[PDB]
Amino acid sequence: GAPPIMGSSVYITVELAIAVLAILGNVLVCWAVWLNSNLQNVTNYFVVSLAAADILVGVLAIPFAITISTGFCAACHGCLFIACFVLVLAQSSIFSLLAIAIDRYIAIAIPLRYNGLVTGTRAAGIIAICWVLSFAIGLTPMLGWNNCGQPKEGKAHSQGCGEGQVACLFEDVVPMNYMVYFNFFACVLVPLLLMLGVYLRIFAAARRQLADLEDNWETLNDNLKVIEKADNAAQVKDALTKMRAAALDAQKMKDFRHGFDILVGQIDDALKLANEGKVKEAQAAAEQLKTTRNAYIQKYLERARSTLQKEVHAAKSAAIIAGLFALCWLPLHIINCFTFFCPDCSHAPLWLMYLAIVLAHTNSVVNPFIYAYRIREFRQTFRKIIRS
Ligand SMILES: CC(C)CCC[C@@H](C)[C@H]1CC[C@H]2[C@@H]3CC=C4C[C@@H](O)CC[C@]4(C)[C@H]3CC[C@]12C
Ligand SMILES: CC(C)CCC[C@@H](C)[C@H]1CC[C@H]2[C@@H]3CC=C4C[C@@H](O)CC[C@]4(C)[C@H]3CC[C@]12C
Ligand SMILES: CC(C)CCC[C@@H](C)[C@H]1CC[C@H]2[C@@H]3CC=C4C[C@@H](O)CC[C@]4(C)[C@H]3CC[C@]12C
Ligand SMILES: CC(C)CCC[C@@H](C)[C@H]1CC[C@H]2[C@@H]3CC=C4C[C@@H](O)CC[C@]4(C)[C@H]3CC[C@]12C
Ligand SMILES: CCCCCCCC/C=C\CCCCCCCC(=O)OC[C@H](O)CO
Ligand SMILES: CC(C)(C)CC(=O)Nc1c(F)cc(C(=O)Nc2nccs2)cc1F
Ligand SMILES: CCCCCCCC/C=C\CCCCCCCC(=O)O
Ligand SMILES: CCCCCCCC/C=C\CCCCCCCC(=O)O
Ligand SMILES: CCCCCCCC/C=C\CCCCCCCC(=O)O
Ligand code: NA
Numbered sequence: 001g002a003p004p005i006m007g008s009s010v011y012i013t014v015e016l017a018i019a020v021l022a023i024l025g026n027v028l029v030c031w032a033v034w035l036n037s038n039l040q041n042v043t044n045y046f047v048v049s050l051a052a053a054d055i056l057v058g059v060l061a062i063p064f065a066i067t068i069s070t071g072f073c074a075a076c077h078g079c080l081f082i083a084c085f086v087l088v089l090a091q092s093s094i095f096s097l098l099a100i101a102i103d104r105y106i107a108i109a110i111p112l113r114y115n116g117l118v119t120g121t122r123a124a125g126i127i128a129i130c131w132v133l134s135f136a137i138g139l140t141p142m143l144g145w146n147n148c149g150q151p152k153e154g155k156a157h158s159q160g161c162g163e164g165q166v167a168c169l170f171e172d173v174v175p176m177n178y179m180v181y182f183n184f185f186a187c188v189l190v191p192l193l194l195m196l197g198v199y200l201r202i203f204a205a206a207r208r209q210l211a212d213l214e215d216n217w218e219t220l221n222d223n224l225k226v227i228e229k230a231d232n233a234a235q236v237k238d239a240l241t242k243m244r245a246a247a248l249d250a251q252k253m254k255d256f257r258h259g260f261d262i263l264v265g266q267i268d269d270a271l272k273l274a275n276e277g278k279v280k281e282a283q284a285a286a287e288q289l290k291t292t293r294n295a296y297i298q299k300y301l302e303r304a305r306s307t308l309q310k311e312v313h314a315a316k317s318a319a320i321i322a323g324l325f326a327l328c329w330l331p332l333h334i335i336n337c338f339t340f341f342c343p344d345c346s347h348a349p350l351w352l353m354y355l356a357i358v359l360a361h362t363n364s365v366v367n368p369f370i371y372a373y374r375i376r377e378f379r380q381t382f383r384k385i386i387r388s
Pocket of ligand 7: 017020
């Protein structure tokens, strides 16, 4: 058996490398939001809460994991605290990710009341509540659900520990039934699945809205053709009444309101002629609608489409971040499941525990990269911060 300081040297060096990069990248995220008012919105207050959690992974959770890798003698509840603290930060991350998903759902499903409903003041209070709940959930073992009543006395004596002390190792103090049923199933898997459901609803809502935009445009152009080849005033009137309802339905900024004003007025003009039995005059008046459509309506159509595509792009970036949290944390949770549910299976070997721990920690590095690669306003602010 090779000297343990050699393998732990590699593990510890990698942990420290991750801690440095987790602190630097997420400090940059927080600085960017602090400095750029275009980045100061409710979505990005949850982004900052998530960056703060990742900063604390570098400042506290990684030094704690390095300390625990030594198995040093410690009062059992002190060991328990440094072992559980990373769970607080993971839980807070989950609350932030779920809040971000819900925020984007509200923005796409009910844009007209988003600004009245989702305010910065309410967001700060939500963030404070979620941090309190993260402490309660992550430190729940400190309330008595722990293995400190059954210390491994042979291991403690072999290391020369003193009274009330244990060799400090995560699995000796944190119960695995808490880790699997309460932390993983209830507090991690369930929120991640709820997030998956929110994102499905976001993309379905976008796809449906971009469909309805295209439907109204098609109805407008189809009914223009119907009028042109109509044969009596009654047919002209039928198509015009559909167009009028569809115009108001698409009405639901000054040049925008002017263009629809023109449009509905021109439909009313032609409809009045059609009811008077003046087919040719009604058809000629309807042809004027094509001038309004080119100058105004199509511009509104293109801008509505472009706004929806930007909402889709923003939601995908947020979903990538949630998906990467899952990818990085799941191996460690799955290993706990094997330890717990398969007592006939040999425990995952030490090199694999190390690997799964640093994979989980690497998730605290990756978000600033996603923001830089996918969000212009962050990328340009990062550049100004780094340059200046
Ligand atoms: C505001 C921040 C920076 C302060 C951080 C304080 C941290 C480092 C403190 C808070 C409580 C402390 C623990 C409390 C009790 C014990 C039991 C002892 O047998 C070994 C040390 C150990 C495990 C301590 C390690 C350091 C510790 C985790
Ligand atoms: C911002 C400030 C107030 C942080 C407050 C955290 C304090 C109150 C908590 C955090 C961790 C706690 C320690 C965790 C574990 C142990 C080991 C146990 O054998 C005696 C108590 C002791 C030493 C606790 C004392 C209280 C403690 C230090
Ligand atoms: C989330 C995505 C990346 C899936 C990752 C799956 C990983 C975590 C899976 C795939 C194969 C699994 C291993 C397969 C067999 C064993 C041997 C057993 O005696 C201990 C657990 C152990 C070592 C498993 C640990 C978990 C494991 C490494
Ligand atoms: C997408 C979501 C649902 C991922 C969560 C799936 C998890 C909970 C699944 C993936 C593979 C599963 C493991 C596959 C094999 C075994 C070995 C068996 O002797 C006990 C159960 C155990 C250890 C399973 C426990 C549950 C498990 C870890
Ligand atoms: C800006 C600063 C922000 C705050 C920065 C916080 C840094 C915490 C660092 C390391 C935690 C190490 C955990 C404590 C290591 C314990 C070693 C020990 O206690 O030795 C006991 C042994 O039994 C002999 O008595
Ligand atoms: C590697 C050792 C065995 C030599 C020391 C040790 O016990 N290290 C350790 C640690 F510091 C943190 C965790 C941890 O965070 N596990 C989680 N599972 C799900 C969410 S967090 C697991 C660990 F094994
Ligand atoms: C542009 C560069 C950004 C800053 C770079 C900082 C580099 C820090 C990286 C790794 C720290 C490695 C220290 C290794 C000492 C551990 C010794 C041991 O295992 O006992
Ligand atoms: C920005 C400030 C961040 C804080 C710096 C702290 C980093 C130190 C890293 C690891 C601490 C390791 C704890 C030592 C274990 C003791 C081993 C033993 O006692 O047997
Ligand atoms: C440890 C398990 C979780 C604990 C469950 C119950 C603890 C807290 C419950 C609810 C917090 C709800 C916040 C409502 C505060 C009122 C704010 C307002 O004025 O509108
Ligand atoms: Na995180």
